[PDB]
């Protein structure tokens, strides 16, 4: 039942995202409501989060692949829909496998940007 509910919610959110994409093409991305400016964000992370690196492509693309278990998939998407991961950057979900990969990539991004600030603050 949880799997079915999560899948339907994702589909509904994606459908709403397409409808909102029509309106951001009319009034720019502010003029919708607060709710439809949180739907867009969590539904611009779902789209980025649906991409997965395949182990078969390790040689060509270099990046190591991921095999996401079904249990992880349901929880990972379920948490995103509720809004638990509303502070993670959008790009952390692009070509990553599982929720843990999202978090580790966030560490590598937050720490990476830390050096950039110390550089840009200095020099």
């Amino acid at each position: 039942v949880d799997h079915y509910n999560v899948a339907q919610d994702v589909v509904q959110m994606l459908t709403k995202y397409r409808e909102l994409q029509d309106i951001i093409a009319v009034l720019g991305i502010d003029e919708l409501s607060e709710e439809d400016k949180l739907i867009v964000d969590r539904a611009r992370k779902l789209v980025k989060f649906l991409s997965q690196p395949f182990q078969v492509a390790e040689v060509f693309t270099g990046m190591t692949g991921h095999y996401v278990q079904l249990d992880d998939t349901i929880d990972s998407f379920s948490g995103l829909l509720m809004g638990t991961y509303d502070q993670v950057p959008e790009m952390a979900f692009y070509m990553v496998g599982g929720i843990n990969s999202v978090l580790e990539k966030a560490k590598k991004m937050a720490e990476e940007a830390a050096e950039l600030e110390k550089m840009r603050r200095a020099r």
Binding site: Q87, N100, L103, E104, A106, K107, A110, A113, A114, E117
Partner: peptide, 30 residues
Amino acid sequence: EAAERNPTGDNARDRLLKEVLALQARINQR
């Protein structure tokens, strides 16, 4: 007021999520 008075795999995600966001706040500070 009473609620304030009173107070494993999922913990790791919470730890990482908290720690991940900990640096995001620190970078903003300085």
